[PDB]
């Protein structure tokens, strides 16, 4: 009922994940920006990292690499790195042209895209769903809002519930 702003975004992501009855691993908010293209004159919507909330629940070379990257990130900013943690981390550098990829298709068409089960992810033909599935996710969800797209992921197979959709409706802006 009250139009939310960026200053409560982290709180609303936390509220979504901590209050949900199902075991969601994380939530991401993909925010809108625009990329003006000089060659066509088009102002295209681009979805990029807004914020996220990771709740949670690999070979040596991979672990050393991941731990190394965390160390380097710790440095700039100021033991095991799990697959879902890594997926969440890597997500921060992703962006999506409107209509393209899981968040882009959701936003273009103002859609709820609910992919539940490994086969739904790998059969979606959607690169981000495929990536989630490789990192152990079994449910991925994108819900378009007035300001972008809310994404949920889980390592469990989760069916769409009324209660989850009610919470999302109360925690983001809709037209």
């Amino acid at each position: 009922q009250p139009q939310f702003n960026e200053d409560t975004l982290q709180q609303r992501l936390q509220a979504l994940i901590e209050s949900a009855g199902e075991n969601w691993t994380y939530a991401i908010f993909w925010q809108i920006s625009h990329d003006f293209d000089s060659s066509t004159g088009d102002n295209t919507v681009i979805l990029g990292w807004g914020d996220g909330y990771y709740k949670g629940e690999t070979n040596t070379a991979e672990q050393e690499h991941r731990k190394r990257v965390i160390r380097e990130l710790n440095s700039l900013i100021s033991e095991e790195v799990t697959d879902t943690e890594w997926f969440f981390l890597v997500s921060m550098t992703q962006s999506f042209v409107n209509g393209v990829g899981l968040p882009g298709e959701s936003f273009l068409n103002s859609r709820v895209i609910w992919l539940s089960g490994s086969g739904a992810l790998t059969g979606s033909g959607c690169e981000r769903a495929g990536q989630g599935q490789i990192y152990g996710l079994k449910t991925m969800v994108c819900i378009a809002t007035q300001n972008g797209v809310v994404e949920l992921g889980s390592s469990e197979v989760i069916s769409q519930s009324s209660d989850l959709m009610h919470k999302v409706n109360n925690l983001f802006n809709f037209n």
Binding site: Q10, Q31, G48, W49, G50, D51, G52, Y54, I70, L73, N74, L76, I77, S78, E85, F88, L89, M92, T93
Partner: peptide, 18 residues
Amino acid sequence: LPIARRASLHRFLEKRKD
């Protein structure tokens, strides 16, 4: 680093230590 990402990184890395 974009502010949005750095802010999230900060919170993520800090929650990591627990």
